[PDB]
Write an enzyme that holds these catalytic residues in place. Structure first.
Site, PDB file in Angstrom:
ATOM      1  N   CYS A 117       0.846  -1.054   0.043  1.00  0.00           N
ATOM      2  CA  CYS A 117       0.076   0.059  -0.035  1.00  0.00           C
ATOM      3  C   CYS A 117       1.035   1.315   0.046  1.00  0.00           C
ATOM      4  CB  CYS A 117      -0.878  -0.002   1.127  1.00  0.00           C
ATOM      5  SG  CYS A 117      -2.087   1.390   1.128  1.00  0.00           S
ATOM      6  N   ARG A 130       0.355   4.023   2.627  1.00  0.00           N
ATOM      7  CA  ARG A 130       0.390   3.736   4.076  1.00  0.00           C
ATOM      8  C   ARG A 130       1.483   4.759   4.784  1.00  0.00           C
ATOM      9  NH1 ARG A 130       4.731  -1.338   4.767  1.00  0.00           N
ATOM     10  NH2 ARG A 130       6.407  -0.369   3.625  1.00  0.00           N
ATOM     11  N   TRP A 166      -7.964   6.878  -2.057  1.00  0.00           N
ATOM     12  CA  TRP A 166      -8.089   7.373  -2.980  1.00  0.00           C
ATOM     13  C   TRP A 166      -7.272   6.777  -4.159  1.00  0.00           C
ATOM     14  CZ3 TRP A 166      -6.657  10.806   1.102  1.00  0.00           C
ATOM     15  CH2 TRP A 166      -5.274  11.332   1.314  1.00  0.00           C
ATOM     16  N   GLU A 176      -3.358   3.628 -12.908  1.00  0.00           N
ATOM     17  CA  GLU A 176      -4.078   2.685 -13.730  1.00  0.00           C
ATOM     18  C   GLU A 176      -5.438   2.235 -13.020  1.00  0.00           C
ATOM     19  OE1 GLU A 176      -3.264  -1.308 -13.897  1.00  0.00           O
ATOM     20  OE2 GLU A 176      -3.912  -1.636 -15.929  1.00  0.00           O
TER      21      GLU A 176
END
Ligand code: HEM
Ligand SMILES: COc1ccc(CCNC(=O)C[C@@H]2CN(c3cc(C)nc(-n4ccnc4)n3)CCN2C(=O)C(C)C)cc1
Length: 304
Positions: free
Chosen positions: A81, A84, A244, A249
């Site tokens: 992520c 993070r 968000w 892509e």
């Protein structure tokens, strides 16, 4: 190599106390360690309370502050992520007292409303009741809160989201009226207390979409619906969250999102969110696991 499984499966029985207690103790240590030198006496008192609760009830409840800390540390622990880096910017909705699918639906509506924020996206997680014996699981059967249906064409090509062909058929099988567009928003399929899932259309006004700049478009809110939060030996198999978009892509853009004032992780947003994060400074566990698709493991009670 000795990687761990990123998947955490179903249970048929409560976690054994002999397994639960050490994990709880270790989490309680992590939490109070976030204060470092303070609260030695409070740390010890919580350890005693948690231990007697587990011995008497077979499990324990996190405080709200412990839950919030857990959701943020699990986020910090998410290997891939990119978001993070600003893990302190997370709104937590506590739905641990939820009992029905209708109630699940209302919690999710609230989440979508708050997180979408008319395009000014905010990260949020909604935490439903923890697993007890494994026969009363809450689960969202969706992979995402918002995602388009996928329909197979006679030639083998897909109309819509090719990745959802199976889930879309399941919705149809569950009685969902199959439209046949390229941008049909899938219903929420919600399982409460281990019961058969119920189907809920998402109110269209709750779904913000970006029109591409042609014919194309996409939803503004990326929300993962299907992971399990693990913390202190406890498991929460329903804990949808959102951030968000990265924008590199989405699947349908960088101009269209910016033009319609929908947050993406561009340089400005990266800097501002990290800035806001920094201001908040005034086996990995906890952790988000993947699960087995619930329609592969569910034992149907009604099957009509
Ligand atoms: C605020 C905006 C956020 C952005 C820009 C963002 C972006 C991303 C991206 C790009 C991925 C990687 C996909 C891949 O390469 O496989 C990802 C994965 C993930 N994100 Fe986020 N994220 C955000 C918020 C969140 C939040 C709020 C949580 C949970 C509290 C979260 C939990 C995760 C998890 C668990 C994964 C999968 C990690 C893995 O399997 O290694 N993210 N995110
Ligand atoms: C917002 O961040 C993005 C998420 C997804 C994408 C498209 C790439 N799609 C995927 O990676 C597919 C899924 C879904 N996926 C998603 C999907 C959505 C809609 N949102 C998130 N997400 C939001 C916040 N953090 C993650 N994650 C997690 C990664 N996925 C995996 O299969 C990994 C196990 C390799 C771009 C940006």
């Amino acid at each position: 190599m000795n990687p761990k499984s990123l998947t955490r499966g179903p249970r048929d029985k409560p976690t054994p106390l002999e397994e639960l207690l050490p994990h709880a103790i270790e989490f309680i240590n992590q939490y109070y360690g976030s204060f470092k030198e303070a609260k030695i006496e409070e740390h010890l008192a919580r350890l005693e309370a948690v231990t007697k609760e587990i011995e008497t009830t077979g499990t324990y409840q996190l405080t709200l502050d412990e839950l919030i800390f857990a959701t943020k540390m699990a986020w910090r622990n998410a290997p891939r992520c990119i978001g993070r880096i600003q893990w302190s910017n997370l709104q937590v909705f506590d739905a641990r007292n939820c009992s029905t699918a209708q109630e699940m639906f209302q919690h999710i509506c609230r989440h979508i409303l708050y997180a979408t924020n008319n395009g000014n996206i905010r990260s949020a997680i909604t935490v439903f009741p923890q697993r007890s014996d494994g026969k009363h699981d809450f689960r969202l059967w969706n992979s995402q809160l918002i995602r388009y249906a996928g329909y197979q064409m006679p030639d083998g090509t897909i109309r819509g989201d090719a990745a959802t062909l199976e889930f879309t058929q399941l919705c149809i099988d569950l009685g969902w009226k199959p439209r046949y567009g390229r941008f049909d928003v899938l219903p929420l399929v919600l399982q409460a207390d281990g019961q058969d899932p119920e189907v809920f259309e998402i109110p269209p006004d709750l779904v913000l979409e970006v029109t591409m700049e042609l014919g194309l478009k996409w939803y503004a809110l990326p929300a993962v619906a299907n992971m399990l939060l693990e913390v202190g030996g406890l498991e929460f198999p329903a804990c949808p969250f959102n951030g968000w978009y990265m924008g590199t892509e989405i699947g349908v853009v960088l101009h269209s999102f910016q033009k319609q004032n929908v947050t993406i992780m561009d340089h400005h947003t990266a800097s501002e969110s990290f800035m806001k994060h920094m201001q908040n400074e005034y086996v990995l566990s906890p952790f988000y696991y993947y699960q087995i698709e619930p329609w592969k493991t569910h034992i149907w009670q009604n099957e009509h």
